[PDB]
Structures are given as structure tokens and as C-alpha cells.
């Protein structure tokens, strides 16, 4: 793809049966998706946000299919308002910022 | 440029005498820089963040020189931890996300 930023980079992603969209976001270090039912061992990690501390839970080698590319990344699942796909999975579908 | 995201997109920008760097960030709608001394009429705008409400102040047709391109954008100046150059100035140096 080639995405332009006239309007929030919302791309739809598939993660385990499950589809949904979230922002491609070079802001963030971490990918964080809304409460979903992933399988495996998970650690609990504390993320911040207006008020602050939110406990999401960290899944670890979770595949993600991002607007047709596959990738393996540590996804944090939890009470997030918006889906976000950090630099962490950015890196992997091999996104670059240009101009 | 072509930026890769193996590591936070920090690019150095110049805004009024003043240089500094901030993230290129397709996350954010708004560009927000740390307290600096811009000239003109400014409105006061309330931005959020772990705890929450921060009062920055909005300058309006402020030029920005981003890693050699010029642009005219509404910059919000205030107690921000990190410089950020929203989609708002992204758009203008004509950044795109790719892969």
C-alpha cells in the first residue's frame, strides 16, 4: 500500500479468526488491541493513559495479518479505546515513512 | 527521506530560530511541541495525558521546517514531554506510510 495521512491511518487487520482495524501508528512502541480471546501464556503489563494505569496482558509470538502481510509480534490485549499497531509490528510488514 | 521504524522516528525540525527534534507520528492528529516562545495570538487548548488535562496554547499559521521541507501548521505549545509532529503537519511535508 501507500497510505496518505489526510485522515487517520486506519487499516484493517486480522488476528485470530478476528478482524478489526487499528491505526498504523509510528508513534507507539507497542501494538495494543482491545479485549480479545487469544490462546496462550500471557504476562500482565501496565500501560498508561489519562488517569493512567491500565493492566493489559501481553501475548508473545502472535501472528498478525496486516493488510495482507503476515507478521509475528508481541501484542498487548486489554482495555484499549483504540487498536494500535506499534512500531513493533510496523517494522515487520516493513513500513517506512516517506516524503 | 525514507524513514524506517526499527527505532522511533525522531527527526529534527526547526521552528523559529529554534531547532529540536520530535517524532514524525501518524498516531496523532495534532503537532505539540514543548514550551517555546512563539510570537502571536494564541488560544488555550486542553490536551490529555496520564492524569490528563494539560492546558497548552494553540498558535495558528506557524511555519515549520521539517527535515528540509517547509510547512504551515497550527502547532500546540505547552507542557509536552515529547515533541510530536501530528498528521496535521505530516500531510503537508507530504508524508505517506508504505509497505
UniProtKB/Swiss-Prot annotation, chains A, B:
Active site residues according to the UniProt entry: 25
Domain of life assignment: Viruses
Domain named Peptidase A2: residues: 20-89
Region (Dimerization of protease) location: 1-5, 49-55, 88-99
Assembly notes: Homodimer, whose active site consists of two apposed aspartic acid residues.
Function in brief: Aspartyl protease that mediates proteolytic cleavages of Gag and Gag-Pol polyproteins during or shortly after the release of the virion from the plasma membrane. Cleavages take place as an ordered, step-wise cascade to yield mature proteins. This process is called maturation. Displays maximal activity during the budding process just prior to particle release from the cell. Also cleaves Nef and Vif, probably concomitantly with viral structural proteins on maturation of virus particles. Hydrolyzes host EIF4GI and PABP1 in order to shut off the capped cellular mRNA translation.
Protein name (database record): Protease
Full-protein residues shown: 491 to 589 of 1437
